[PDB]
Amino acid sequence: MDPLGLQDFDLLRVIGRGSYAKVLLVRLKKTDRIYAMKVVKKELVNIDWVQTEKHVFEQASNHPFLVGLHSCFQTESRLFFVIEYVNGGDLMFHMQRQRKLPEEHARFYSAEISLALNYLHERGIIYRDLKLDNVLLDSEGHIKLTDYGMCKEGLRPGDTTSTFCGTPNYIAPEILRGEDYGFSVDWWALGVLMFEMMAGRSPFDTEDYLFQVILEKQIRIPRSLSVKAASVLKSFLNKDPKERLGCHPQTGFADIQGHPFFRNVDWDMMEQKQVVPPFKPNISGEFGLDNFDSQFTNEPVQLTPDDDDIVRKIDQSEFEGFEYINPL
Numbered sequence: 641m642d643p644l645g646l647q648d649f650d651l652l653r654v655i656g657r658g659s660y661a662k663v664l665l666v667r668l669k670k671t672d673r674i675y676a677m678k679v680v681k682k683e684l685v686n687i688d689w690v691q692t693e694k695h696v697f698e699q700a701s702n703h704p705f706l707v708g709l710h711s712c713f714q715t716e717s718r719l720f721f722v723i724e725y726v727n728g729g730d731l732m733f734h735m736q737r738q739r740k741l742p743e744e745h746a747r748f749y750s751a752e753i754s755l756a757l758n759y760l761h762e763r764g765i766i767y768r769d770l771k772l773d774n775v776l777l778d779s780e781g782h783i784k785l786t787d788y789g790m791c792k793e794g795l796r797p798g799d800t801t802s803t804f805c806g807t808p809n810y811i812a813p814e815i816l817r818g819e820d821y822g823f824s825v826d827w828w829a830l831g832v833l834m835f836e837m838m839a840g841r842s843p844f845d846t847e848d849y850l851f852q853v854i855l856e857k858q859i860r861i862p863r864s865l866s867v868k869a870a871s872v873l874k875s876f877l878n879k880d881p882k883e884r885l886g887c888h889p890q891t892g893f894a895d896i897q898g899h900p901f902f903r904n905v906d907w908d909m910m911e912q913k914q915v916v917p918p919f920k921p922n923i924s925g926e927f928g929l930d931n932f933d934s935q936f937t938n939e940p941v942q943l944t945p946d947d948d949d950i951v952r953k954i955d956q957s958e959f960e961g962f963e964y965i966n967p968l
């Protein structure tokens with residue numbers, strides 16, 4: 641009946657690695673439930689990467705299309721975030737096989753993404769890293785936004801922020817112009833993503849040049865796309881934030897829903913997960929491990945032994961209060 645620690649988990653598999661986290665599939669023994677667990681060595685964060693992740697995960701959790709936080713704990717060397725295991729692959733891989741999605745399919749995904757982004761936004765958070773490989777699919781085919789490492793988390797009314805970041809292909813013109821910006825940059829990114837889903841290529845097709853393309857060149861809509869598909873791509877991919885779909889100060893989200901491209905969507909049904917996804921993820925392997933790279937799943941299921949020369953220099957006071965258990 642004590643607060644959670646490593647001791648309470650079976651390590652099942654290594655499933656992922658990013659710049660910060662080693663990501664493992666784990667099982668909470670006493671409940672037999674499985675989770676992903678992000679393992680971040682303290683030597684990486686000895687700054688407030690930590691608080692932002694923790695808050696975003698929290699502010700999220702229990703929303704249908706965002707990866708939620710089960711619990712956080714620490715050891716002497718590491719932080720651990722225990723989170724929902726999402727095992728249906730990701731839009732990236734999915735675009736590779738499909739090459740190009742039907743407009744109906746892209747509508748479904750962009751609806752679920754839109755709901756997720758709006759929800760984030762109404763809690764003062766700019767996602768800032770929407771891209772195909774940050775849209776996971778759960779086992780049933782519903783999306784979940786992942787990777788909150790880029791998020792900004794404290795935007796009150798209009799209020800703005802300033803940091804140049806994001807993934808090159810998805811970076812809004814505001815940011816590229818070095819403007820102050822709000823939520824607008826997420827809707828731009830959704831435009832790029834939707835274009836990718838329906839056209840099967842980036843709308844931008846040297847990183848210095850890419851930024852020149854984004855800023856100064858007209859976007860070519862592929863001729864085979866419906867009028868509604870063209871309209872919505874043109875609206876989200878407006879270079880002017882003020883004029884961009886979803887970006888109007890008070891009715892942003894309302895406009896998105898009211899856009900003809902979306903006329904078929906029952907938003908309340910979508911938000912409740914009562915729309916049947918257009919695609920059912922294949923779940924092969926134990927716990928669907930086959931949807932993860934084998935370079936990860938073939939790793940030994942362990943944490944790398946600590947190194948005292950490093951571990952002794954960690955200021956442990958920096959992580960007081962890290963511990964968390966969700967309140968559901």
Ligand SMILES: Nc1ncnc2c1ncn2[C@@H]1O[C@H](COP(=O)(O)OP(=O)(O)OP(=O)(O)O)[C@@H](O)[C@H]1O
Nearest residue numbers: 656657658659660661663676707724725726787789
């Ligand atoms: N909730 C999850 N369920 C299943 N797999 C996940 C989950 N979160 C992350 N992964 C796997 O782990 C990989 C690395 O996670 P992520 O990209 O979030 O790492 P990070 O180090 O936190 O972020 P960054 O690399 O952006 O700094 C993901 O691409 C994904 O394959």
